Each structure stands twice: as C-alpha cells, then as structure tokens.
Design a protein around this ligand. Structure first.
Ligand SMILES: O=c1ccn([C@@H]2O[C@H](COP(=O)(O)OP(=O)(O)O)[C@@H](O)[C@H]2O)c(=O)[nH]1
Length: 351
C-alpha cells in the first residue's frame, strides 16, 4: 500500500507558505498513522519527490489537497498544470481533501484551452476523468455537493475533520503561559473579501490593542458596506508552525469563519487557538449550538460583547486562567480520540 499526496496548485517545499505547510503536515500525520506516503511536487526535496521521477500509477491511492486553479496574470502556473497532468494520468479514484469552501475541485483545461498559450497543452493531457471522492472538512455534505456541482466526475462525498491533524501530531503540545502584549489577535488572509463583514465587526474600532497577522493588509478593507475608522495593527505573515506561539501573545484570539462555515466547518484556527495561551472567543453565529465548548463565556455575538468579554478577562486573571484550563482540557478530550480519528481517515480513503 503506497500513497501519493499532492497539492493541486501550490509548490511544496517547507513551512514558509501555508499551502506547503498543510501538505507536509498531512504527509506527516498520515505517516504517523502507519501508512507509507510520498509527497509529489515540482522538485525532489526534504519532504518531496518530483512529478518527473515517479509513475502516478505506482501508487494505490492518490490524495489531493484543494487549491485554486486560477492563473495569476493569465500566465502558466506549473504547480497547477503539473499537478493536473499528474492527476489526469491516474487511472483509479482520486481523493480530494476539501478544507477550504472556496477551493472545490475544478478542471484547468476549460480555462487553459482559451489561453493564447493553449497550444502548449492538450485536453487528453489536462482533463481529469477519474472518479473523485471529496473528503469534506465540513459536516454539511449538501454544501460540499453544491460546491462541486460543475464537475460531474466528483461522485462521492464523506465528512472527515481533516483539520484535527494539528492536535493529533506526535509533536503537539499546549502553549505555556506567555507574557501578554495584546488584547486580541487574529491571523489569516483576506480570503478575497469572503469574511470582510465579520473581520470589521470584531477586529476594527474596538478600542482594544488588536493585531491582525498574516497575508491580509489594511488597504484591502474598502467595502463601503462595512466602513471603519480605526483598524487593528497588521503585521506580516508567519510560518504555520509558529502560529500558536503568536496567538499566545494575546489575552484572547478570535474565531470567525465564512458564511458557509457556520455550524459546518471546524477550522485549523479553532485548534491553534484552543491550544494557545490566548482565551478562545467564538462568534456565536460560527457555532450556534456551542459544539466547540459547552460554556457561553467563550462566545460573543457582536463587537460590543467582544469588548465586554475582553475587559472581563483583563479584569480577572482568575477568570482568564479558568477559561484557559477549560479549553485546554476540551482540546485534550478530542486528542483522546486519536485512534478513532486515524481509523476514520483510513476508512475515508478506502483502507
Ligand atoms: O501568518 C499566518 C496567518 C495564518 N496562517 C495559517 O492560516 C490559517 C488561516 O487561514 P485562512 O486565512 O484561510 O482562514 P480560515 O478560513 O482558516 O479561518 C491559520 O489557521 C494558520 O494555520 C499562517 O500559517 N500564518
């Protein structure tokens, strides 16, 4: 049993980029599961083999991490093109890891064919005809199915909390008490504006010392529907393996998501935040049934409630420590089900 895992549109090398990091982490957690897996990318490296040095059909299972297939500047993107050529040659079922609602499986050929450089490729080369099974991080498969409505070869859907790899990794550990320099923190990208209203609501004009780290930039928030005066402080992006340490500099860390994530997707930040030294504060709409932690003190409905909660946390060190103790225990509750999680993944990829 040999498994191949690839990222459909991003080069994989190290932990300097998020897509590369997620791919390596998945490779690691699958390996720690007792499975023989290889990461196939553009070049041979510390964690990878190149597309050229291997035969896709030498593998028994092909796993693909979701990604956009958009061509920046309209120019060829070898990460995208090489990955799909690899996939198109595979003669068995493909397992697509759907971790981001905006990145459902999509065919590059329909786009490439109209490009002025189309002559460089053919339909037979890029068109992926193998049947595809979507492994949805979201529990709502109707939403997963609707997202893949344009690709008829995606004929199977199954829910699996992919993002838990963060807590099941053999090297995982909870963050230690950290000196506080911030009131609230949130790390992420602008996600093409899909979450602008929520970002402005909880991170702007709060009167608190808030930091927004990651790819996002202040100038991207210009939608007239979500105006603001005082923005949080934007700092550069950091490696994925340094995220919890970063969250730990703040008294609290925000949990928000895209509209389609509400009561559907549990995201990486949920675990990265819960494991940190920052109290997890969740937007009520993101988890209305409080399935993350059955304690209302971890939830906020709007900007005003977030500010009030942070003031309480700043006022009572006892409250802050209690809540940290609670979220750490709750996280460990899920870690205790590692064996089941591992078995569910194997079942997901027909093992
Ligand atoms: O500087 C940064 C900011 C974010 N992240 C990662 O990016 C994720 C957030 O991704 P996204 O912005 O798409 O938001 P989500 O939809 O995951 O909430 C975080 O959980 C981290 O794992 C990172 O590695 N470095």
């Amino acid at each position: 049993m040999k498994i191949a895992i690839i990222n459909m549109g991003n080069n994989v090398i190290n932990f300097k980029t998020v897509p590369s990091s997620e791919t390596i982490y998945l490779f690691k957690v699958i390996s720690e599961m007792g499975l023989n897996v290889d990461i196939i990318s553009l070049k041979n490296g510390v964690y990878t083999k190149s597309f050229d040095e291997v035969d896709v059909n030498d593998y028994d299972r092909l796993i693909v991490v979701n990604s956009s297939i958009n061509f920046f500047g309209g120019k060829p993107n070898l990460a995208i093109l090489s990955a799909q050529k690899f996939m198109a040659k595979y003669k068995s079922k493909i397992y697509y890891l759907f971790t981001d609602i905006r990145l459902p499986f999509s065919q590059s050929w329909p786009n490439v064919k109209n490009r002025p450089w189309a002559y460089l490729y053919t339909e037979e080369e890029l068109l992926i005809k193998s049947p595809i099974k979507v492994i949805s991080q979201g529990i709502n498969l109707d939403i997963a199915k609707a997202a893949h409505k344009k690709v008829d070869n995606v004929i199977e859907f199954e829910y699996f909390p992919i993002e838990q790899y963060k807590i099941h990794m053999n090297d995982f550990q909870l963050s230690k008490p950290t000196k506080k320099t911030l009131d609230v923190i949130y790390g992420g990208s602008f996600r093409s504006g899909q979450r602008e209203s929520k970002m402005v609501e909880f991170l702007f004009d709060t009167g608190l010392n808030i930091e927004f780290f990651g790819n996002a930039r202040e100038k991207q928030f210009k939608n007239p529907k979500y105006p603001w005066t005082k923005a949080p402080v934007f700092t550069g992006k950091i490696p994925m393996n340094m995220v919890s340490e970063k969250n730990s500099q703040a008294i609290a860390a925000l949990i928000i998501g895209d509209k389609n994530y509400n009561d559907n997707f549990i995201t990486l930040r949920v675990w990265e935040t819960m494991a940190s030294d920052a109290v997890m504060l969740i937007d009520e709409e993101f988890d209305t049934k409080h399935r993350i932690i059955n304690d209302a003190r971890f939830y906020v409905n709007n900007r005003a409630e977030l500010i009030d909660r942070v003031n309480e946390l700043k006022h009572s060190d006892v409250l802050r420590k209690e809540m940290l103790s609670i979220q750490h225990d709750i996280l460990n509750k899920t870690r205790a089900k590692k064996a089941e999680w591992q078995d569910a993944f194997k079942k997901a990829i027909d093992l």
